[PDB]
Amino acid sequence: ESADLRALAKHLYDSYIKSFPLTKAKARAILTDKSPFVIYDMNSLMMGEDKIKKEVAIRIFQGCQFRSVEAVQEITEYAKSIPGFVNLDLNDQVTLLKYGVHEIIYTMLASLMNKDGVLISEGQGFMTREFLKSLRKPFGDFMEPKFEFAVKFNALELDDSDLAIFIAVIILSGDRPGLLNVKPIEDIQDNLLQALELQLKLNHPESSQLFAKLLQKMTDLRQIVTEHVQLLQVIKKTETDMSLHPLLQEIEK
């Protein structure tokens, strides 16, 4: 019944707010109290360290990786609040988070992008898209496909309460490799999909087939993840100098 789907939508929105400090509404408010420092080239980067809290590219990369680690923690905390998730087989829990985390990272990253750049450091900074594109060797191409996805994804005009259900749906795929019991993951996702359908039709009544258009975006996500994993393998052989966080590259298998 509809009353149960709304209750689940409201639960997930509430946990999303608690697990993710920098929401989309806050990011949209900043992008449009206190403006960010805009990093757009070699010198402002170093003024921004003065203002806001080793080659320049790999420096940016090392911080892009530490942010992802931070994001893994928040997604983990958010996953536990999804009704039925902690009751799954512990190995499936790990498997769902292993394969689910990058798709959510890049989904949430779009909340922080416009066509020009991306908010960094809890919104205190803003790094321009073309400065990022101007990095050397293989780094200039780490962020460009995310920008391309964000532009199309952000055109859907989702708000946080929408994204809470969508992130939850991503986590409970069951499509994932290595899963021991797919059926209880699917009953959960099934109910999440029911919740997302009512949510989008109630929130975006004039937005035709938004539900379906949203699920088709789950294809662009798998692709940028694929693209990114390969970009890391290049980094590893180019940069034997440069390490990687064990939370990330153990997920990165």
Ligand X SMILES: Cc1oc(-c2ccccc2)nc1CCC(=O)c1ccc(/C=C2\SC(=O)NC2=O)cc1
> Among the candidate windows 120-128, 181-189, 205-213, 231-239, which touches ligand X by CB under 6 A?
120-128
Contact (Cβ atoms closer than 8 angstroms) between residue 97 and residue 171: yes
Under the criterion CB under 6 A, does residue 127 sit at the interface with ligand X?
yes
| Cα of 119 vs its chain's centroid, Å | 13
Q: Number of residues interacting with ligand X: please give it, by CB under 6 A.
A: 21
Number of residues that make up the chain = 253
Interface characters, 65-104, with ligand X (x: CB under 6 A): --xx--x---------------------------------
- Calpha distance 135→49 (Å, rounded): 18
- Bridge partner residues of 155 (DSSP): none
- Nearest C-alpha neighbor of 223 from the set 106, 129, 134: 106
Residue 157 half-sphere exposure toward CB, CA atoms < 13 A? 8
> Among the candidate windows 119-127, 162-170, 177-185, 210-218, which touches ligand X by CB under 6 A?
119-127
Minimum CB distance to ligand X, residue 62 (Å): 7
Tokens 């990011």 belong to which residue?
Answer: 27
Under the criterion CB under 6 A, does residue 175 sit at the interface with ligand X?
no
Among 120, 172, 200, 221, binds ligand X (CB under 6 A): 120
Classified as helix, coil or strand, 199 is helix
Interface characters, 19-48, with ligand X (x: CB under 6 A): ---x----------------x-----x--x
Closer CB to ligand X, 143 or 179, in the complex: 143
Classify burial at 92, counting beta carbons within 10 Å of its beta carbon; exposed 0-12, middle 13-18, buried 19 or more: buried
Binding site for ligand X (CB under 6 A): 22, 39, 45, 48-49, 59-60, 63-64, 67-68, 71, 105, 108-109, 112, 118, 120-121, 125, 127
